[PDB]
């Protein structure tokens, strides 16, 4: 219900929008808390979609004293997810991930149920988590001089 709820809040216009919503939900399910919204399970953060690019900002209970930013850039048929960490007003690049929306989105069905729209979800989920979320958390923990949580 959260995916479908967040999806309708998003007012997706294209395949890229639909992919970003899914990415955001995966961040939420890993424990990240989004800035720009007071109801993380109901609506997308304000300005999540700004002039061709997407920006998602989070804090995490396992990473006190830091904030994580996903900057998502449409490059071609690709979407590039950039993960960036801010600690003590210092910005550090963490990781990038290249995603191909066509592999996971049925763009012809964006107005329908999310079950009709997303394909190979478990594929995209383990890709995003294994190559972005977990490396980001581990990188952050290190930067914060904390023991790893995995």
Swiss-Prot record:
It is found in: Cytoplasm; Nucleus; Mitochondrion; Cytoplasm, Cytosol. Residues 1-144 are annotated as: Important for dimerization and interaction with PSMF1. The ubiquitin-like region mediates interaction with PRKN. It is linked to Parkinson disease 15: A neurodegenerative disorder characterized by parkinsonian and pyramidal signs. Clinical manifestations include tremor, bradykinesia, rigidity, postural instability, spasticity, mainly in the lower limbs, and hyperreflexia. Substrate recognition component of a SCF (SKP1-CUL1-F-box protein) E3 ubiquitin-protein ligase complex which mediates the ubiquitination and subsequent proteasomal degradation of target proteins and plays a role in several biological processes such as cell cycle, cell proliferation, or maintenance of chromosome stability. Recognizes and ubiquitinates BIRC2 and the cell cycle regulator DLGAP5. Plays a role downstream of PINK1 in the clearance of damaged mitochondria via selective autophagy (mitophagy) by targeting PRKN to dysfunctional depolarized mitochondria. Promotes MFN1 ubiquitination. Part of the SCF (SKP1-CUL1-F-box) E3 ubiquitin-protein ligase complex SCF(FBXO7) formed of CUL1, SKP1, RBX1 and FBXO7. Interacts via its C-terminal proline-rich region with DLGAP5. Interacts with BIRC2. Interacts with CDK6 and promotes its interaction with D-type cyclin. Interacts with PSMF1. This is F-box only protein 7. It comes from Homo sapiens. The gene is FBXO7. The chain holds residues 181 to 330 of 522 of the full protein.
């Amino acid at each position: 219900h959260s995916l479908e709820t967040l999806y309708q809040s998003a007012d997706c216009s294209d395949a890229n929008d639909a992919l970003i919503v899914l990415i955001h939900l995966l961040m939420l399910e890993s424990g990240y808390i989004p800035q720009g919204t007071e109801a993380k399970a109901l609506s997308m953060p304000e300005k999540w979609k700004l002039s061709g690019v997407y920006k998602l900002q989070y804090m995490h209970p396992l990473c006190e004293g830091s904030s994580a930013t996903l900057t998502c850039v449409p490059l071609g048929n690709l979407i590039v997810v950039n993960a960036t960490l801010k600690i003590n007003n210092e910005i550090r690049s963490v990781k990038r991930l290249q995603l191909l929306p066509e592999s996971f989105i049925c763009k012809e069905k964006l107005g329908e149920n999310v079950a009709n729209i997303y394909k190979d979800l478990q594929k995209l989920s383990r890709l995003f988590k294994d190559q972005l979320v977990y490396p980001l958390l581990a990188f952050t923990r290190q930067a914060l001089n904390l023991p790893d949580v995995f």
